[PDB]
């Protein structure tokens, strides 16, 4: 007689696994009532209500924009300026970053210690960030100290001292910062991508600038920079949280009196020094780094181009992923599926960067040396596929994800104030959520195919790579993989 099906150890294990499988064979319908794996385009313009964003223009062209939440206990107030490294010159390059270092270094009324003691006595925070086309200084304070923060910002923008010893100390701080450009390889890769893609244009320069420029920086340089660029028509004062529009407007009218009023205007600056894309690559071969990092990019779209929304949808379609994400093998993005299913990268990330007259659309990846060939094949395949085959489900899911991320990231006074300032600088207005959603849902599969055929198909690419990249395919092989010869 044969043994019964629990005597032998392997038969018993087979019985256990079979019983578990039968348990999975019969689902419970109470837990299968609402969620669906099929994406549906939904219209919910009722929940989309938000507090009004008041925009007031002063007689000198200064704009004050507030988003009031008087139930909040905090607020974010700041200045967003249409200024950055792109609007400098070759010999002035780096001045904006130096000013960012020097702006909290004391004024006629306040010394460095007074300024820090005033701020951190109320528990506030002071932030300064400069980019290629945008500069912002803002304060996160309690609702009571809105007027004090506005006074602090107006003072530092209008009455900075720029002591020569302070300038010399910051000169060496920044020189050491330039000498220590390592450990942040993402930022390095993107800098080199900008430098080769926008070669011989103001957009190609780094924010930091060359070492000789920072060595040559003096007081009159910084004062001339502020006089040239920090003008009323180029500045937006944005407040979010527990703030009333009228009080902020009155305080701004009181404090921001001695501005520059230089006639230099950003549209003319972009017009006479335009940014163009040059298909090219920089390969920084270093076989001691454990991981390779590269970015591939196409020429993208400007802020105001209608195709920018479609490019955002396409970026969502490509997606982003790293090895610590649980479900990369199951996501809607085919590129993420390929990468996660075959373990061919440490991280992947699609980016859509916009500027006033151009943009960058591409993919940034981190991977081991031996994965590079397959990873590059997969990236190029899935990017080029956007010009040929787009399913309605994928574009619907991407639209839903994009709307969700845009609304979900907008939490807190600081992100709201940043959104207000950025939109006022790039669009001239804060685009209401309903209009943005309507523009997003106008991006269908045919729209994605049209935009991809305009920006991706048979197009020149810009590459920036660093690390053990000897097996990264050369420029001709990336350029060939931008079209499909079976169509």
């Amino acid at each position: 007689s044969p043994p019964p099906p629990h005597l032998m150890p392997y038969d018993h294990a087979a019985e256990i696994i079979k019983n578990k499988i039968k348990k999975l064979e019969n689902p419970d319908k109470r837990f299968l009532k609402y969620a669906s794996p099929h994406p549906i385009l939904a219209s919910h313009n009722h929940i989309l209500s938000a507090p009004e964003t008041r925009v007031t223009t002063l007689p000198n062209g200064l704009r004050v924009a507030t988003e009031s939440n008087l139930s909040a206990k905090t607020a974010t107030v700041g200045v967003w300026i249409d200024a950055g490294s792109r609007f400098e010159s070759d010999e002035t390059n780096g001045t904006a970053h130096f000013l960012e270092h020097m702006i909290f270094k004391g004024t006629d009324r306040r010394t460095v210690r007074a300024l820090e003691e005033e701020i951190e006595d109320i528990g506030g925070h002071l932030n300064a960030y400069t980019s290629r086309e945008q500069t912002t200084y803002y304060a996160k304070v309690l609702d009571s100290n809105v007027n004090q923060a506005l006074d602090v910002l107006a003072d530092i923008l209008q009455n900075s001292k720029f002591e020569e010893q302070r300038i010399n100390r910051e000169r060496d701080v920044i020189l050491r910062e330039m000498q220590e450009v390592e450990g942040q390889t993402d930022e390095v890769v993107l800098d080199h991508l900008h430098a080769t893609a926008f070669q011989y244009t103001p957009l190609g320069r780094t924010i930091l600038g060359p070492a000789q420029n920072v060595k040559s920086i003096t007081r009159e340089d910084l004062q001339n920079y502020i006089k040239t660029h920090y003008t009323a028509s180029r500045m937006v004062i944005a407040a979010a949280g527990a703030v009333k529009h009228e009080e902020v407007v009155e305080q701004v009218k009181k404090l921001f009196t001695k501005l520059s009023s230089d006639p230099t205007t950003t549209s003319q600056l972009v017009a006479n020094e335009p940014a163009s894309f040059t298909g090219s690559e920089v390969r920084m071969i270093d076989d001691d780094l454990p991981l390779a990092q590269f970015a591939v990019a196409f020429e993208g779209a400007s802020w105001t181009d209608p195709d920018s929304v479609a490019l955002m949808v396409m970026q969502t379609m490509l997606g982003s992923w790293n090895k610590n994400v649980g479900g990369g093998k199951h996501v809607g993005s085919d590129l993420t599926q390929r990468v996660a299913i075959n373990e061919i990268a440490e991280s992947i990330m699609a980016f859509n960067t916009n500027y006033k007259d151009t943009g960058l659309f591409g993919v940034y990846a981190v991977a081991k040396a031996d994965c590079l060939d397959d990873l590059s094949y997969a990236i190029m395949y899935e990017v080029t596929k956007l010009a040929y085959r787009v399913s309605d489900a994928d574009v619907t899911r991407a639209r839903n994800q994009l709307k969700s991320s845009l609304l979900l990231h907008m939490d807190g006074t600081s992100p709201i104030a940043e959104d207000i300032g950025r939109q006022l600088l790039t669009y001239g207005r804060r685009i209401p959520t309903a209009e943005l959603f309507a523009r997003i849902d106008a991006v269908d599969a045919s729209t994605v195919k049209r935009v991809a055929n305009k920006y991706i198909y048979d197009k020149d690419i810009a590459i920036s790579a660093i690390g053990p990249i000897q097996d990264l395919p050369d420029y001709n092989k990336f350029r060939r993989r931008t079209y499909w010869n079976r169509y």
Partner: peptide
């Protein structure tokens, strides 16, 4: 709806190539 257009394009290509190798002008 692009595979059908690809098939039509390649069918036109195949016909053009046929008339080009064999050149049946004296038979048509």
């Amino acid at each position: 709806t692009i595979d059908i257009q690809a098939a039509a394009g390649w069918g036109i290509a195949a016909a053009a190539g046929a008339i080009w190798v064999v050149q049946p002008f004296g038979w048509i």
